[PDB]
Amino acid sequence: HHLRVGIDVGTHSVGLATLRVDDHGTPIELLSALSHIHDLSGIARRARRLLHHRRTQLQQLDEVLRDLGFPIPSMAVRHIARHRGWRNPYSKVESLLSPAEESPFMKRKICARQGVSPDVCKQLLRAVFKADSPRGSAVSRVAPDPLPGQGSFRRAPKCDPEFQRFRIISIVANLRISETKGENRPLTADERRHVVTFLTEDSQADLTWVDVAEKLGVHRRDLRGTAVHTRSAARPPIDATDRIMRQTKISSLKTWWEEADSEQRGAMIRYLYEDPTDSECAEIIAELPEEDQAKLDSLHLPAGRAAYSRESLTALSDHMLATTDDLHEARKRLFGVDDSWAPPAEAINAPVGNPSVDRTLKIVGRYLSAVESMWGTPEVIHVEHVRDGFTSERMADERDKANRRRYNDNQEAMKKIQRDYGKEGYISRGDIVRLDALELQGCACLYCGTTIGYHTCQLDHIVPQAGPGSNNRRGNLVAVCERCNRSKSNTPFAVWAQKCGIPHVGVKEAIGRVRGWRKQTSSEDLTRLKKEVIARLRRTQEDPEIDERSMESVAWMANELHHRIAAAYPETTVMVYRGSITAAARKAAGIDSRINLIGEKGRKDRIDRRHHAVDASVVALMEASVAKTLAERSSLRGEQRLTGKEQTWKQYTGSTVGAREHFEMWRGHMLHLTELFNERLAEDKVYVTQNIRLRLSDGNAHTVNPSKLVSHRLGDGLTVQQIDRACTPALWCALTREKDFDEKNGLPAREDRAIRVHGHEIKSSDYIQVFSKRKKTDSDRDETPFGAIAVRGGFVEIGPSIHHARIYRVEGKKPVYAMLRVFTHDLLSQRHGDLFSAVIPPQSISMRCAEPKLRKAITTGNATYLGWVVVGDELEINVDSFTKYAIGRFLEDFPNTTRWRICGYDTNSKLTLKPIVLAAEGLENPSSAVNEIVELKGWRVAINVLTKVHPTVVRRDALGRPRYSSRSNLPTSWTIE
Ligand SMILES: [Mg+2]
Ligand SMILES: [Mg+2]
Ligand SMILES: [Mg+2]
Ligand SMILES: [Zn+2]
Incomplete structure (x- = not known):
């Protein structure tokens, strides 16, 4: 049983695939294929944790001092000040250099100091001498050295x-x-x-x-x-x-x-x-x-x-x-x-403190575990790494921008050549590098110093490369006169220089000329170039032949990933290739335009998110001989771009009969693979998955200045809307328990009113506080409630800090569906319980911000709790009835888009939905509707109208398969009905 797993690591996604091949490598079954989509600082957070813990330690020091007959704010307060200030936030000692927490002393006139033997209490106390200051890493847990003797x-x-x-x-x-x-x-x-x-x-x-x-x-x-x-x-x-x-x-x-x-x-x-x-x-x-x-x-x-x-x-x-x-x-x-x-x-998923990397590692670890459990140990696990790339969305954006830059600098270089030399047609990289080298070298042959120009000079590879192709980096290319190029032939420079006996040709002379180079208009780039050139001018051995590892990634994270995977699957062959291998393979086997993905193709960037699954499938099928041949074809191409001549590299499939046979067989396999993949697409079993968050988001936040509360004289009476915006739930309870509280008219003006909130008596002549977003000079009589909490100095909004929505059917002749958005704040007191069954009482800010009809239905027992959703959840939706408005037009351009992801709660009765299969970046001149639905606002749909079509909330396991039941209490699929 030959199982090959492939993994395509992207910036925002991971493609995953498992393939069964027979004894001779022909793909016979595509067992799995899916795309998993993803979704201050550490320094100052560590700084703050440190600050608070140290602070509490200083408080402990004050505790020690007070009880030691010393006052926290004349010898006594002097001793206080000295021990507090001149030692406790200073960490002077720090003598024999020790992170050993506790620390032995090892060691008028009569007034100071001592003591004598006591008040080592003080010495031990100075922030307990950091014993022990830290609760967080690197103390807990950075595991100890496991070598005998080193365990401390x-x-x-x-x-x-x-x-x-x-x-x-x-x-x-x-x-x-x-x-x-x-x-x-x-x-x-x-x-x-x-x-x-x-x-x-x-x-x-x-x-x-x-x-x-x-x-x-x-x-x-x-x-x-x-x-x-x-x-x-x-x-x-x-x-x-x-x-x-x-x-x-x-x-x-x-x-x-x-x-x-x-x-x-x-x-x-x-x-x-x-x-x-x-x-x-x-x-x-x-x-x-x-x-x-x-x-x-x-x-x-x-x-x-x-x-x-x-x-x-x-x-x-x-x-x-x-x-x-x-x-x-x-x-x-x-x-x-x-x-x-x-x-x-x-472990594969052991955290590295990098969010993108870590999300990737959790995904890979659980996929490989599920694969092994379901089908057995894979013979290969092949990974394609992304590029640069895999550091952040930030660094990826920046590198993309700088790449558009460099692209433009190249286009400008091309324009300037067309202008200055009247070159019509194709302007090869050879043309560009030759001119660049001529200018850099001041129109002199690097090897013999003689004058050369654009007509007379030729481009040389300083050091040749054993086997097909050459090293085509700028640092291996120099402008040279025709005589030196002809004499040098296929020899490394340093070897040829030693025997050519041509005046002014030698290693030292050539180095000298290189040190003379100056920028023609980035000095770092130039300094690097010069070092590279000088090093190559000294070389006496050829660059090594291309081989199976030429395509291997050398990124740190790639080596670390290889290490973790190989260690977790000791019987499995593991390889981590650079992120160009699958594009190269797809071109060489000619299978883009054979996969039935959505998209004009039309590439550009693939709009169908299932393409990551294609790339994983392809990398699973990669083999050593094929990697070598691809690397060679690429090198040959680089060479032929430097000579600007007729490109023949596409005809190269290897230098032995064995290499050419492997390559042809592999092309056959790739054809089979596209058939299996298309067949799986037609069954709709190439999955697009994403995790949902079930735990409460914790802390962070803050960084927020409070809005001002608005005051209302209690005795002047209050509308229902004002009452619903009471600054605390306790105040809301007290207002609505009034015997004359009216569900529509609120509280009438009265001069003898007295209510109790947390023991405090509030009278008609007193003022209560409400949340409001309106000026204090305007009326808030009809302002509707919104998610807010009281804090020091007023209140803050808790807008999108919603943990889940509970879906209800309001029972009646005409049944009505609605939802309760449960704010994270309302679950804090029931943290360690079942979050989806925790009681959400009428006085809570969640209930008070829900649709009035749902509130009334819940309070009278007329609401049936169907089930819960969260942001990130998948919905399968029959979209036949949706032919009006933006969604209808979108559907005109992308019909039968039935899989949608909940992106947020647009209002207390609408969900924001975006399509799962489609990537915004793959859009090419979209109609305004398509851009609205995919890229901008998303599809904003009322819960009642959505629910009328009976959508299915789809929950998937580690292989992307829908889950309908679980003996582990994992969230399962359910139809909203
Ligand atoms: Mg040459
Ligand atoms: Mg060669
Ligand atoms: Mg890739
Ligand atoms: Zn020369």
Whole structure:
């Protein structure tokens, strides 16, 4: 039984698919296919938690002082002030550097000080000397180091520079050198230091193992162990934290890191990640707001929790660098564990403190569990990662905008070439790069210095690439005279220079020319370019051949995801590819326009959300030989764009009979897959799912200034509408219990009225307070109630803070459907109970804001509670009757749109609905109605008219299948009837 799982990670979605193939890889059954749709800062929240806890600790200190015969606000108040101020918020000691909570002393004239032996109460008291200050991480819970002897140290976050260094060293410690066969030796300590120093020189370099081989002075073929597991590293490792810090859009942070103290780099990373307890930062941080702002939450440090503490990480690191041990041997020697000892891996869904990542990880974890339970262990789990991408909606938006920018800069470059050279027709990337290089190089051949121009110069790849294609990055391309290009042939520059004997051709001369480069109009980009070019001008070995791992993602989160999945499914082959693989595959197998998705196709961006399920299905079917061939076709294409010639890359399907046969077979499989997928679409079993929130939203909020309450003299009488806006439920009870309260006319004017609210007597001559949104100079006599709560200084609205809606049928000859929106506030007292059956009493703000007819029906026992919905819930709706207004016209353009998602409660009797299958971004010049329904307001429909067509509230399990019953008490589907 061959099961292949595919996962397509997007910015806002995850496509998921399970495929059964036979012994020769032909897809025979598409078992599952679906699209799961998703939907201050950490630094200052940690700061605030810290502030409150410390504060209460200072209060405890005052408690100690008062009861110690000291006054909280002449020697006595002096001692008070000294101990409070000059110590308690100062944390001076902090002597021998300890996070050990409690802390031993280890150690006129007569008036001060002592004591003598006592008042160590005071010393122990200074915020209890932070014993124990923290309730939250990194104390609870950051799990302890599991190595024997290390159990008092907390495990380090993977973003810690010490972890990054450990990882690099560990990988280097797996490398072998072959000097004769078969006589592998590990790298010596000196070699290890040399390679580690090299890999940490520039975290922004894009190196291959060939670069490492050259640094070691060995042929690439003689360097081994690059593919050994600690997944193995296809490319040499870098410090991912340092790279992120040097590439961040937060200017002053980058600047700081640049000149930072190294120990201070570590301390800073710890601060930004989880420890709100340094002085230097945030004394470093506070500067330059807006950068301090939501920008700081945009900083995406490498995720994950290391298996070991910093202490262990550095001990293991130093040992591996100074010897020839690998990690396994290192751990045995340093800590004495046996050969079977292994640290556990984080669970797939273990939180990384990043909302998008975390939602993705929960989805993947539960899908893989459901797949295994239902069908058995998969042979492969293939993932496609998104791009850049997968950090936030924010960073995705920004990168998209900057991509439209770069697109425009390229279009301008094309225009300028057409203008300046009169080039009609296709303007290749070769044309653009050649002109750019000519200008950069001041019209001189990089290799021999001779004058060249647009007619005479040619573009060269400095370093050739073994096998089909070349490395086509700008840093491997230079403008060159015809003579040097012809002489150099297929040789790396440095090798050719050593033997060509042409005047002014050499490595040093060429480097010199490169150092001479200046911007023709981004200096960072240029500096990077120059470093890349200089490095390539030194190279004496070819770039390595394209292989099955050329398409593998090298993003941190991709490696971490690979690690968690492989550890959770040890018998399964796991791969995480970059987010271009499925588009490449779909083009090569020619299957866009074969899938029967909604959309003109017309691509552009696919409007049908089921496309993520297509991409997951395709990635499930990917295979090593095919990945290699696709990477090659792409490289060949890059090459032929540089020569601007007749493109033949589409005809390349491999260099051996075996590769070409695999590729053709795979194209056959892709054809089968489109048949199975179309058939599944026709059964309507390609699902679109989304989670619903069942728990109460907690805290956060605030940040809100109160509106003013309005005062009414009780004795002047009150209308029903004024009473319904009473500033507290208790006041509402007291007003409506009056013997002369009238359901229509409210309370009449009376001079002898006396009511009781919380023990307090309120008389006719007193004033009560109501919520109002009107000026105090206008009448609120007919103002209807709205969701509000009293707070300090007045009230705030609780607009969309609604937890669920309960649907009722008001019984009668003409039955009427209505809903009660239950505000989150009204469930706080019954938090840990059944939220959907908690009592919502007449005096509650929820009831008082419901339709009067529903209120009256509930109070008289004429309302039948059908069931509950929440925002995010799916509705299946017969839409035949809806041919009027905006919804009718929308339906003209997208007929039989029957699956809808509840987006909100437009009013106390209307739901806002948007279609589930359709993506706003895929719209191309929409009619105003379509834009209104999909993109803007959504379909706003009265509960009574909606319910008359008997829609079904659809609830789905982890495989996206409708759930009609549950022995686990999970929410189930139900028809509103
Ligand atoms: Mg050449
Ligand atoms: Mg080649
Ligand atoms: Mg994708
Ligand atoms: Zn030349």
